[PDB]
Design a protein around this ligand. Sequence first.
Ligand SMILES: [Mg+2]
Ligand SMILES: [Mg+2]
Lengths: 126, 126
Amino acid sequence: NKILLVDDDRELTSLLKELLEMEGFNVIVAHDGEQALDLLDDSIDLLLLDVMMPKKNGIDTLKALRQTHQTPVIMLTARGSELDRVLGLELGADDYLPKPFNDRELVARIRAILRRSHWSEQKLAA
Amino acid sequence: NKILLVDDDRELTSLLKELLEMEGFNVIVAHDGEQALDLLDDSIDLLLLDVMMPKKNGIDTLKALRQTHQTPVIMLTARGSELDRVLGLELGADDYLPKPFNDRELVARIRAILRRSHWSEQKLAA
Ligand SMILES: [Mg+2]
Ligand SMILES: [Mg+2]
């Protein structure tokens, strides 16, 4: 499973890339919404997407990517109010996990969404 | 979209049934895990599942239903610690929302999972 990490915090993306690679995932990193849209293709199984970023924020990135891709999206951001969470889900995200987050919960939420994607893929191939 | 509500709190299930029917859903209620397994068939689009219940708890209900059904499951329970959340996701739930919860976030999470189910169904039919 290939994960596209989108966040301008280079300390967080380096830490998450190491954590997720140790959990068996292939991780690629984008540091803004424009770079995310450049790297998004059919090889991506899931996006971890921040909101506040320079060049193109995560809400605009989510709206743009949903015009061409149904790729699973988890918002992962310091914008964690109940209003922010509903906004992210309604604009096309599958899940929304505020920062600070628990590493184990993030890994379990990634695994839960990819388990459902795999079930859909098995049925489609059959 | 047809929702199976599983919780022993009759005050909560009556309130949620009214809320969800006003949001356009068809809602059926089970008050324990045994009744949930009796009511679970291919017509159910999503389960809202509690943990602490008499006769059969939600963790055992989730394990049993995952042997025959890939139906989307959201755990909705007062067992809200980070450890409880990871446990629920790892045992087969798609999402996990602790009580007390925000009504709008619950509705958005239901809508997000059913939006993904609809995308899978469209592809499968094509
Ligand atoms: Mg940021
Ligand atoms: Mg209960």
